[PDB]
């Protein structure tokens, strides 16, 4: 029969076959189920889609047509849950959030 | 000279489906690849630990779902579980 990608079967953009191969060759368990690569591909695709959409919104606010590490850092740091997920992560060339303490401001 | 095998073409497809008009730079591309790899290792390691704790030998969508619940915060976990369950249900019907 004609070949059908598991990504096409699950309606995903991320490679179910590559995720399965990485789970098998990564020494995680003795066996890997059929739906585990599908679930992992779906979760990864959702996460990257959310981050990319927030970064694109930040880039549009900055009047730019390209997403850069600064926009990724802004998107991640301006979200409570994304900051909790990526608290101990350094983003190269991402800078910091603009924030000055209130007592430092002049009267 | 040997198939560096990044996630760039998949992340670009996701980008073109969420924001059709904006591009991405190489540095942001590498950062997104690093993010995908990191989250993959986190979820896979947590699932492996769950399977070891429960004396199993296979990683299943139940293990992946429990790892997702343990590692993602708040509504992130809920929406990721919804997406994964939807994808698995769609794949089961082939």
């Amino acid at each position: 029969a004609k070949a059908k990608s598991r990504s096409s079967r699950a309606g995903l953009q991320f490679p179910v076959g590559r995720v399965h191969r990485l789970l098998r060759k990564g020494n995680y368990a003795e066996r890997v189920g059929a739906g585990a690569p599908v679930y992992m591909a779906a979760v990864l695709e959702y996460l990257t889609a959310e981050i990319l959409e927030l970064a694109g919104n930040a880039a549009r606010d900055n009047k730019k047509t390209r997403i850069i590490p600064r926009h990724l850092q802004l998107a991640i740091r301006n979200d409570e849950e994304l900051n909790k997920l990526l608290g101990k992560v350094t983003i190269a060339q991402g800078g910091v959030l603009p924030n000055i303490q209130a007592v430092l401001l002049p009267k | 000279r040997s198939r560096k095998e990044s996630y760039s073409i998949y992340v670009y497809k996701v980008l073109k489906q969420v924001h059709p008009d904006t591009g991405i730079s190489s540095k942001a591309m590498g950062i997104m690849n690093s993010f995908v790899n990191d989250i993959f290792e986190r979820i896979a390691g947590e699932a492996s630990r769950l399977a070891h704790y429960n004396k199993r030998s296979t990683i299943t969508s139940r293990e992946i779902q429990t790892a997702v619940r343990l590692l993602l915060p708040g509504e992130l976990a809920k929406h990721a579980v919804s997406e994964g369950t939807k994808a698995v249900t769609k794949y089961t019907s082939s």
Partner: single-chain antibody
């Protein structure tokens, strides 16, 4: 568990200012934005703006900037909206509702309402009013103006009560909503279907998009039962 307490009716003289609270409990206060909705019988539900307690960030509607100002009190878990220069066209019920920072999420929990009386994308709901029996099939359409990527929600409002969320992401059932209600569609065409009716299903059904910065509600659809 999640409750969004509000204040009572506020009789106010024209030209003054009024501030109302949105004390929240039962959830992590800083992880969810608090959106504010005004409802008048002339134009139905309308979106004012929101405040994100995590970083005190706000965003207001184009037509509501200056009129309304949003502040947060993290210590008391309370959010206020202040209305200045109260014009005669300001007598309405103001709803504060919770919404997560996730783009997929919608307004899931609302406040009972604060009746204040002073002494873009257009979403078109095709059926203005409908009648049906106690076991029939009904369908409501929410033809949109521009392309929204499945960012549509459905709400049910009983008379003189706060709206209740039924569908989010244009297909996903809300928390506790029975499988009778089912949404469908993406892009510009959306649909709400109620499978088998009851005497309780008598309410007004709204459709809200949150795909772009100004959130717009639907015209409304009053459903009659027998």
């Amino acid at each position: 568990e999640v409750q969004l307490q509000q204040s009572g009716p506020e009789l106010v003289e024209p030209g003054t200012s009024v501030k109302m609270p949105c004390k929240a409990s039962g959830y992590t206060f800083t992880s969810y934005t608090i959106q504010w909705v005004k409802q008048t019988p002339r134009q139905g539900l309308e979106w004012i703006g929101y405040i994100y307690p995590y970083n005190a960030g706000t965003k207001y509607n184009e037509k509501f900037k200056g009129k309304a100002t949003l502040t947060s009190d993290k210590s008391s878990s309370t959010v206020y909206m202040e209305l200045s220069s109260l014009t005669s066209e300001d007598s309405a019920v103001y709803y504060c509702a919770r919404k997560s920072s996730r783009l997929r999420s919608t307004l899931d929990y609302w406040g009972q309402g604060t009746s204040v009386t002073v002494s873009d994308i257009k979403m078109t709901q095709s059926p203005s009013s409908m009648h049906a029996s106690l076991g029939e099939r009904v369908t409501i359409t929410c033809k949109a103006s521009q392309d929204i990527r499945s960012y549509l929600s459905w709400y049910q409002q009983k008379p003189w009560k706060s709206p209740k969320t039924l569908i989010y992401y244009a297909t996903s059932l809300a928390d506790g909503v029975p499988s009778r209600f089912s949404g469908s569609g993406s892009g510009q065409d959306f649909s709400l279907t109620i499978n088998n009716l009851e005497s309780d299903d008598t309410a007004t059904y709204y459709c809200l998009q949150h795909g772009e910065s100004p959130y717009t509600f639907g015209s409304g659809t009053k459903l009659e039962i027998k």
